[PDB]
Structures are given as structure tokens and as C-alpha cells.
From a paper:
Overall, the enzyme comprises a glycoside hydrolase family 89 (GH89) catalytic module, four FIVAR (found in various molecular architectures) modules, an unknown module, a C-terminal fibronectin type III-like (FN3-like) module, and six putative carbohydrate-binding modules (CBMs). CBMs are presently classified into over 60 amino acid sequenced based families; the CBMs from CpGH89 all belong to CBM family 32, which is one of the most diverse CBM families. Thus, CpGH89 possesses a complex multimodular architecture where the composite modules function together to efficiently act on components of mucin.
The presence of two CBMs with the same specificities indicate the potential for a multivalent interaction, thereby increasing the overall apparent affinity of the enzyme for regions that display clusters of the GlcNAc-α-1,4-Gal motif.
Residue numbers in the entry: 1208 to 1343
Write the structure that this text describes.
């Protein structure tokens, strides 16, 4: 597979110094975007520059065990925006990473961390994403 998201422009909400939005598409699963002052909601958008077939996305967090509530949406050149993964009511431990089928042409990826459920090992963690890949 080829990660067509790699080095694509990331826009979105404010970031902690040292942990910019650009860390979402740098290809490094260890480099993070972290929301500034741990603000929620926090959001990131990847511009794929026009419509590109995407088989699936991968959303990577720093490590397993957060309890973020989040959603992933895709959009085409049309303006048709659509939710592909909705974990906004999540209360359980999160996996380290999520595969998400798309199987169509898309032009943008939108990730939003809307909240966090109580408990687990990292209950004061700030909203943060290690990587989003778009495989074709
Ligand atoms: Ca990264």
C-alpha cells in the first residue's frame, strides 16, 4: 500500500508548541500533534489535493489505552462530507490504531476529538493524534 496522506497539508485547531498539526502526516508513528492547552474539541483536516481513491484510513494514537471520544469524516470535491467512524459515545479503552474503510475517491479527511470518558491509565491525557494514513 501507498500512504497518499504522507506530507499532505494539515489544518485545524491550535497545537502545543513542539507538537504541530503537521506531525499527523509526517510518516512517523512516534511524532504527535497535541491540542494546545488540551483543549476539546480539537480538530485536524488533511487536504489530499483533489479527489483520490482511498481504500482505507489508519488513525494512530500515541499508545493504546486512552479513552478519547472522536469521529473521522471524509469529504469529496463535491462538498459531500460523511462520517466513516463515529466514536463520539465511546467509553472504553481505545486501541492504539484504527483502520477505517473508505473505498472511494475523497479529497479531505477530518478528525475531531470531541471528549474523553473517565478512567483508565491515562485519564488526564490531552487530545492528540500520532498519524493518519490514507492507503491506496
Ligand atoms: Ca506522526
Amino acid at each position: 500500500y501507498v500512504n497518499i496522506a504522507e506530507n499532505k497539508n494539515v489544518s485545524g485547531s491550535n497545537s502545543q508548541s513542539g507538537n504541530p498539526l503537521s506531525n499527523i502526516t509526517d510518516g512517523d508513528l512516534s511524532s504527535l500533534w497535541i491540542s494546545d492547552n488540551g483543549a476539546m474539541p480539537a480538530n485536524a483536516t488533511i487536504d489530499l489535493e483533489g479527489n483520490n481513491f482511498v481504500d482505507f484510513l489508519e488513525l494512530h494514537f500515541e499508545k493504546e489505552g486512552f479513552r478519547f471520544q472522536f469521529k473521522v469524516e471524509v469529504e469529496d470535491e463535491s462538498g459531500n462530507r460523511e462520517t466513516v467512524l463515529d466514536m463520539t459515545s465511546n467509553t472504553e479503552d481505545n486501541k492504539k490504531s484504527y483502520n477505517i474503510p473508505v473505498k472511494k475517491e475523497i479529497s479531505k479527511i477530518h478528525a475531531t476529538i470531541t471528549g474523553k470518558a473517565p478512567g483508565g491509565s491515562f485519564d488526564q491525557a490531552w487530545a492528540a493524534i500520532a498519524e493518519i494514513k490514507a492507503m491506496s
